[PDB]
Design an enzyme around this catalytic site. Structure first.
Site, mmCIF file in Angstrom:
data_model
loop_
_atom_site.group_PDB
_atom_site.id
_atom_site.type_symbol
_atom_site.label_atom_id
_atom_site.label_comp_id
_atom_site.label_asym_id
_atom_site.label_seq_id
_atom_site.Cartn_x
_atom_site.Cartn_y
_atom_site.Cartn_z
ATOM 1 C CB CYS A 125 -0.810 0.054 1.344
ATOM 2 S SG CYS A 125 -1.986 1.396 1.572
ATOM 3 C CD1 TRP B 80 -4.647 -3.700 5.653
ATOM 4 C CD2 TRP B 80 -3.248 -4.739 4.339
ATOM 5 N NE1 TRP B 80 -4.685 -2.928 4.569
ATOM 6 C CE2 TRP B 80 -3.783 -3.813 3.728
ATOM 7 C CE3 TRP B 80 -2.160 -5.715 3.771
ATOM 8 C CZ2 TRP B 80 -3.277 -3.065 2.601
ATOM 9 C CZ3 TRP B 80 -1.863 -5.518 2.752
ATOM 10 C CH2 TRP B 80 -2.427 -4.015 2.142
ATOM 11 C CB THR C 191 -6.810 1.684 6.763
ATOM 12 O OG1 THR C 191 -7.837 1.757 5.669
ATOM 13 C CG2 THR C 191 -5.777 2.782 6.610
ATOM 14 C CB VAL C 192 -1.686 -0.458 6.384
ATOM 15 C CG1 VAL C 192 -1.954 -1.685 7.376
ATOM 16 C CG2 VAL C 192 -2.031 -1.001 5.026
ATOM 17 C CE1 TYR D 27 -4.340 3.747 -5.088
ATOM 18 C CE2 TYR D 27 -5.843 2.016 -4.995
ATOM 19 C CZ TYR D 27 -4.522 2.510 -4.727
ATOM 20 O OH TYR D 27 -3.491 1.854 -4.159
#
Lengths: 333, 321
Positions: free
Chosen positions: B30, B63, B97-98, B161
């Site tokens: 990411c 994740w 999220t990361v 994206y």
């Protein structure tokens, strides 16, 4: 056309009947009798277009063009007034195969040569079809047509072309239609080994075989033409773009800029066909707007390698007006 | 919507900076997380902020720690990052999220607000920077950095994206244009100038780098951002390689996990889940000649040393030698 967890293996069931000077199979060459059906999208058909164009057979063999998109019943005549072929009067090519073999079970492909009076497919064996333009229609070639398949080179042409066919022409399909990482991996390697092999060869020589453009160059060209526009992304043949392979790119542009080649090439319909029809690989059916095509018309310096393109022949004139590629669908001027 | 709580010198939100207390969770795949990695690396925060790495692939629960002995995070001991969000907000409904920063003793996510996180490394962790850490976000440039970065964010970072995830030809077409207009805009800028803002590497360059790093490997094919490859864009390519070859950048970059993540996780766009074997990465290490444009990368600072041993990118996953 993807079988999951499996390598792509093509189904080669063709109609092998031939159109010949002597009329051996019941189909003698004569002007006004047959009609070539092709599509700008398909590279097999695109050879037929180039060859016909190089030999000046436009006035004696009629031409129909299919649209890039279609359903499960293959090619349709949807670019044409009425949604039907001007001459044959059919909405889809399958009808022409049907008229000959009612119930025809095998693949409905282009190029196909149809006999006009009867509305029946004579042949769709694209490797034999292009040879037969050079050998059997020889009486109707324009003055200055070249020898794309002269007797004294056929051995060499045939050995080079088989290599290219399996490793490249079909190599790209074997990558894109691979149904598994491992199948894909294998194809990728064979593909790029071959292209290096060909780079070495063409560093040393203007064209693939001998001094002149031949059937081999045509067969290779239809694939390079599609490389950056499709194969690179769509089929993931992505070690590098064509434009980053110095000699092959120069070779490609030399042929593209040669009359009868680039003028047969419709980039919009090529992209549209692959990206929209192959929903199993690209389900959004979104067509990339790239690449920028302008580099195709840049100087290649292959003349510095000698050769005569047409070899005591002449380049053909520009295409007949209904066979010209719309400017918006070509490279920008 | 993120978790906007901050880790700060004054401890305003109840989370003061101190060494050994927090742990950064990221993934090589990411690009938001990859900034975190670079910045941490440039400022020498490795010894004071611990690092966990997630694997590129995962289910609908985001994740997991499947590259790691046991299939769990060495220090947090959890199999998937969702647990850490759960321990803080037991229903947590928003995105998992990361990068995320987790407080170790408690096992709870503190924050996942990645733009603020990287600013806060520069501003709040200032006491634990190594000697020679640079000014990635100095007061006298912030205005300029902020305006440039916003442009890049919407047109580029997020531009790619919007192309790939476009649900229609027309949507896609629009994204494509905005993307490449911007990249031309940036080419013009970087023709005359070694870095994006001023004389020095700054937060802006980092944010732009994570996107270029992924361009040829993913965005160009996968997301169909295909006017041209990065390597065909003379100035941006030279700029990109200059940063890649700068310590703390290329050494944070794992091309295998990047590709694996995009091509395998996004089955809706690429249902074969086949990962391309290309591109050939060797060109990244070729000479760029950006030194001729002047600049000081670290600007009265020093380049960091090579990464700690558990943070090195396996050689097979990096560029070949």
């Amino acid at each position: 056309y993807v079988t999951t967890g499996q390598e792509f293996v093509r189904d080669t069931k063709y109609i092998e009947t031939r159109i010949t000077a002597d009329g051996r199979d019941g189909y003698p060459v004569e002007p006004g009798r047959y009609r070539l059906i092709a599509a700008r999208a398909c590279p097999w058909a695109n050879r037929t277009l180039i060859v016909r164009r190089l030999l000046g057979l436009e006035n004696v063999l009629s031409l129909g063009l299919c649209g890039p998109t279609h359903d499960k019943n293959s090619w349709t005549f949807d670019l044409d007034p009425g949604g039907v072929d001007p001459v044959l009067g059919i909405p889809r090519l399958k009808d022409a195969y049907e008229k000959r073999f009612p119930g025809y079970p095998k693949g409905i492909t282009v190029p196909a040569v149809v006999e006009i009076a009867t509305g029946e497919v004579v042949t769709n064996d694209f490797p034999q079809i292009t040879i037969d333009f050079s050998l059997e229609w020889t009486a109707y070639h324009r003055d200055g047509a070249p020898q794309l398949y002269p007797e004294h080179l056929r051995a060499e042409i045939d050995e080079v072309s088989k290599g290219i066919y399996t490793e490249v022409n079909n190599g790209v399909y074997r990558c894109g239609f691979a149904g598994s990482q491992d199948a894909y991996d294998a194809a990728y390697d064979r593909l790029f080994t071959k292209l290096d092999e060909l780079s070495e060869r063409l560093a040393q020589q203007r064209y693939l075989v001998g001094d002149t453009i031949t059937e081999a160059d045509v067969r290779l060209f239809t694939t390079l033409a599609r490389f950056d526009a499709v194969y690179h992304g769509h089929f993931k043949c992505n070690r590098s773009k064509l434009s980053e392979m110095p000699v092959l790119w120069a070779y490609a542009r030399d042929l593209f800029q040669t009359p009868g080649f680039g003028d047969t090439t419709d980039f919009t319909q090529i992209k549209q066909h692959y990206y929209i029809v192959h929903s199993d690989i690209n389900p959004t059916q979104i067509v990339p707007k790239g690449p920028d095509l302008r580099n195709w018309l840049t100087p290649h310096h292959r003349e510095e390698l000698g050769g005569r393109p047409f070899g005591d022949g002449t380049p053909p004139g520009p295409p007949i007006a209904a066979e010209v590629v719309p400017a918006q669908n070509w490279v920008p001027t």
